[PDB]
C-alpha cells in the first residue's frame, strides 16, 4: 500500500492525537490503534504532513499509551498543559435548572469538562461579579464563587462578569474573564393548548419531539399508561404572543403529584405502579394539569375502523381505504399480519389475499391507507377478526360494473365527488401547490380511476399568477403571485378540463410611519442618527422601533437591523430574539441621505453614527422608510433633520 510514515505522535487533547509525518492523507482511522482501540476519525492536512486522530474516549494524563500506526509503534504520555482559556459570552435564564458557565481551554473545540479537568489534576474556580466590580450571587447556593460553574435557580437579571481560573495541582493558574447575560429566556406563553404524549413503545429511551415518531412509538390519544410503560412529549402547543406554536422542549417542565405512581426524569415519564397521578406541565409561568391513570391491563387490539367504511369501487379498479387500529384505551395499536384476520365475503367483492390490514409503520403506528381492488361485481362485508374470532370492525364493499361515460377535471382533494366544481382558492401561506386530475366515471356516475395523462397537455393562462405542469396522472398547479388564473387541460388542441384558481397571499406590511417631531440643530456636538427621527426602545441586539403602523394586528415587535450590510432593515421579530432570522417578516428599510445643497463633510450613511455636528455644518438629512431601499418610489414616509450650526459674527 501507500507509504505513510509517522515521525511524531502527541496527545494534544483529552480525545485527540496529532501525528506528524509524510503521506498521512493515505491513513485510514483503522490504521491507528491506541491501547487496543482503533481511532474513530482521522483528519489529515492537504499536504499529508499532519493528521488529527479522534479517539473513542478520553485519556488519563501522565499514563503510558501505546499507539500503533500500521507497522510503527510509539509510547507517549498526555501532558495536559493549560496555556489559555476563553469564557463563553452566553445568555442564561433567570429561573432554570441545569445551567453552567461554559469555557474552552487552549484551541479545543467544545466546552471544557470540569469533572474531567478534576480527574486530570486541575482545579477550577469561578468568580461572578456585577459590572461595577462588586460580587454577584449567581452560582448554586446564592453564591459569588463556584468550583463547578453551576448557576443558581433564581438569578437577578442583568449582565455579569465571570472569571474562570484553572490551576494545575501544585503548578500554575491560567485565568480569563467573560461577560454573560442573565435574561428571561422563558417562553412567554399565555395558554397551553394541545399536549401530546407519546409512548416509548420499544423501550429505547428515545421519543421524538416536534417530528414523526420512530420505531414502535405512538402518540397517545388517552391519559392511560400500563404499569412498566414509559412515555414523553411528542409536542406541546402554547399561545406565545398571540400565536399558537410548538414550544421548544427545553422550555417545558413536567412534575408528578405522586412519584410512586408516575416518576419524571427530564420530561420522560415512567409508570411505577397502578393508580392515579397528575402531571403538571409548566411552560414559562402558565401550567396545565393532566390526570393520568396507571393500569395493570396490557394493551390489546379491540377496534379496526375503515374510512370510508362503505366503499363503492368499479371492477378491477383500486381505491384507498384508511384503517385505524386501536386498543381498549382508544390508543394506537400496531397490528401485524397475524393480528387481524380479514374474513372476506363469499360474494367475492375482495379477492383472496387482497386485504391485509398492517399498521406497524414507523411514524404512523395504528394508521395505514391501503388500496382495495374491486374483484367480482356485487356487495359484501369484510369482517375484521382477532385470533379468538371476535369482531373488531368491518368494511362494506360494493363492486360495480366498469365503463367510461364521463371525464371530469377535479381537485385531487375532491376526487370522486361527481359534479363538484374544480374551482379553488390557493393560499400561498399554507400551501404553494394545488393538484388536479381527470377523473373517469362510469355511465352510472361511479368514480372509476384517474385518466392516464400521456398525450395530454396543460397550460396556465396567466404565467405570472401561477404555473401548471403534468406530473404522472396529476396536474400540479404552482402558485407564484396573488390573482385569478385559468388552468386548461387539453389533448391535440381539444379541451379536456378547465379550472379557475384564485391565488391569495396575505402578508403583514407597513401601513404608515409616525416619526418624532424634529427641530433645527443649531449647536455643535449633537449626535444625529435613526433615533433622532424614530422612537427606539434600546436593545443590546437589534432595537425595537415604535411608530411603525402595520396592516394587521400583531403582538410581535418591529425591530431594525443595527449593523452589517442589512443595517436599516425593518422586520417583524416573530420569534422575539432581537435578530433577523427564521420566520421573521421583512417590513422595509430605513435609509439616510444628505440633500443636494448640504455642506456636511462628516456625514455618514450609517444609521447609528450619521452625524455629530461640528462648526459650520449646514444642511439637511433625509431619513426615509421604504418598503424596499432599492425602489426609491416604494417610500412610505420621510422626516428631514435641519442642520444650521450658528457661528456669527464671523469676521
Amino acid at each position, epitope marked *: 500500500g501507500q507509504m505513510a510514515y509517522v515521525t511524531d505522535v502527541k496527545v494534544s487533547e483529552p*480525545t485527540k492525537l496529532t501525528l506528524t509525518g509524510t503521506g498521512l492523507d493515505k491513513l485510514s482511522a483503522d490504521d491507528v490503534t*491506541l*491501547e*487496543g*482501540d*482503533k481511532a*474513530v476519525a482521522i483528519e489529515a492536512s492537504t499536504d499529508g504532513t499532519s493528521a488529527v486522530v479522534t*479517539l*473513542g*474516549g*478520553k*485519556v*488519563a494524563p501522565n*499514563k*503510558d*499509551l501505546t499507539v500503533k500506526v500500521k507497522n510503527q509503534s510509539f509510547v507517549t*504520555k*498526555f501532558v495536559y498543559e493549560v496555556k489559555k482559556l476563553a469564557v463563553e459570552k452566553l445568555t442564561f435564564d433567570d429561573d432554570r435548572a441545569g445551567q453552567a458557565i461554559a469555557f474552552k481551554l487552549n484551541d479545543e473545540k467544545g466546552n471544557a*469538562d470540569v*469533572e*474531567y479537568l*478534576n*480527574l486530570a489534576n486541575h482545579d477550577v474556580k469561578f468568580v461572578a461579579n456585577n459590572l461595577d466590580g462588586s460580587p454577584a450571587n449567581i452560582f448554586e447556593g446564592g453564591e459569588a464563587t463556584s468550583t463547578t460553574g453551576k448557576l443558581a435557580v433564581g438569578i437577578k437579571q442583568g449582565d455579569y462578569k465571570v472569571e474562570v481560573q484553572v490551576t494545575k495541582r501544585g503548578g500554575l493558574t491560567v485565568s480569563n474573564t467573560g461577560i454573560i447575560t442573565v435574561k428571561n429566556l422563558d417562553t412567554p406563553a399565555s395558554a397551553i393548548k394541545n399536549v401530546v404524549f407519546a409512548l416509548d413503545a420499544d423501550n*429505547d*429511551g*428515545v421519543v421524538n419531539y416536534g417530528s414523526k415518531l420512530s420505531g414502535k412509538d405512538f402518540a397517545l390519544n388517552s391519559q392511560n399508561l400500563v404499569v412498566g410503560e414509559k412515555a414523553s412529549l411528542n409536542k406541546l402547543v402554547a399561545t406565545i404572543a398571540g400565536e399558537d406554536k410548538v414550544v421548544d422542549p427545553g422550555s417545558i417542565s413536567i412534575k408528578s403529584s405522586n412519584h410512586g405512581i408516575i416518576s419524571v426524569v427530564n420530561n420522560y415519564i415512567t409508570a411505577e405502579a397502578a393508580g392515579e397521578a397528575t402531571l403538571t406541565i409548566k411552560v414559562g409561568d402558565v401550567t396545565k394539569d393532566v390526570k393520568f391513570k396507571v393500569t395493570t391491563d396490557s394493551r390489546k387490539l379491540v377496534s379496526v375502523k375503515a374510512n370510508p367504511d362503505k366503499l363503492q369501487v368499479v371492477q378491477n379498479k383500486t381505491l384507498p381505504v384508511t384503517f385505524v387500529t386501536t386498543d381498549q384505551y382508544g390508543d394506537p395499536f400496531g397490528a401485524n399480519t397475524a393480528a387481524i384476520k380479514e374474513v372476506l365475503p363469499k360474494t367475492g367483492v375482495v379477492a383472496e389475499g387482497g386485504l391485509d390490514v398492517v399498521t406497524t409503520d414507523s411514524g404512523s403506528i395504528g394508521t395505514k391507507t391501503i388500496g382495495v381492488t374491486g374483484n367480482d361485481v356485487g356487495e359484501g362485508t369484510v369482517h375484521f377478526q382477532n385470533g379468538n374470532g371476535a369482531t373488531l370492525g368491518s368494511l362494506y364493499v360494493n363492486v360495480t360494473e366498469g365503463n367510461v361515460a364521463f371525464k371530469n377535471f377535479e381537485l385531487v382533494s375532491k376526487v370522486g365527488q361527481y359534479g363538484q366544481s374544480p374551482d379553488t382558492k390557493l393560499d400561498l401561506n399554507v400551501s404553494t401547490t394545488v393538484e388536479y386530475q381527470l377523473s373517469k366515471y362510469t355511465s352510472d356516475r361511479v368514480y372509476s380511476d384517474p385518466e392516464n395523462l400521456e398525450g395530454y397537455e396543460v397550460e396556465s393562462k396567466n404565467l405570472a399568477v401561477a404555473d401548471a405542469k403534468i406530473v404522472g396522472n396529476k396536474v400540479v398547479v404552482t402558485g407564484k403571485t396573488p390573482g385569478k388564473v385559468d388552468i386548461h387541460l387539453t389533448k391535440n388542441g381539444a379541451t379536456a378540463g378547465k379550472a379557475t384558481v384564485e391565488i391569495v397571499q396575505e402578508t403583514i406590511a407597513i401601513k404608515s410611519v409616525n416619526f418624532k417631531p424634529v427641530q433645527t440643530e443649531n449647536f455643535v456636538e449633537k449626535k444625529i442618527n435613526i433615533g433622532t427621527v424614530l422612537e427606539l426602545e434600546k436593545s443590546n441586539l437589534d432595537d425595537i422601533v415604535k411608530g411603525i403602523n402595520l396592516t394587521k394586528e400583531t403582538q410581535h415587535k418591529v425591530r431594525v437591523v443595527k449593523s452589517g450590510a442589512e443595517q436599516g432593515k425593518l422586520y417583524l421579530d416573530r420569534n422575539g430574539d432581537a435578530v433577523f432570522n427564521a420566520g421573521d417578516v421583512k417590513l422595509g428599510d430605513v435609509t439616510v441621505s444628505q440633500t443636494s445643497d448640504s455642506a456636511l463633510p462628516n456625514f455618514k450613511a450609517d444609521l447609528y453614527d450619521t452625524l455629530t455636528t461640528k462648526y459650520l455644518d449646514k444642511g439637511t438629512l433625509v431619513f426615509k422608510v421604504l418598503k424596499d431601499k432599492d425602489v426609491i418610489t416604494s417610500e412610505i414616509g420621510s422626516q428631514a433633520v435641519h442642520v444650521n450650526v450658528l457661528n456669527n459674527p464671523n469676521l
Partner: nanobody
Amino acid sequence: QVQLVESGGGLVQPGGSLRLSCAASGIAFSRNAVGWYRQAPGKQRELVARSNTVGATNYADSVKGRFTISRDNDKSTVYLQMNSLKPEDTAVYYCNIYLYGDRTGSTLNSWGQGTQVTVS
C-alpha cells in the same frame, strides 16, 4: 454530579447467567468509553470489559468469550451479559468510565456501591 447505579447481581448456582445493568449520570456518557470493573474480597480491582464511544469492545483475557459488554447512549446505561459463570468471577462488579492509559480505573474519583455476584 456523578451517579453510578449498578443492579443485576444474584445468588445464582454455577453455570448460570446474570444480566448486569448500570444507570449512569454526570460522566459525559456518550463522550467516554465505559466499562465494568470487578473486585474480589482481599484482591485488586481489574477491568473486566470496556466499550468505547462507538461500541468497540475490549475484554480481560480472563473473561473472553464468556462476557459481552453493551452500552446505550439514549438511556446512559451499561450492560454486562455474564454467560457461563465460573467461581473465579467472585467479586462486586462496578460500572464506570474508562480512561485510556488507566487500565484499572485507579485515577477515577467517584464509584458506585457495585452489585454483588455470587456463584457457588
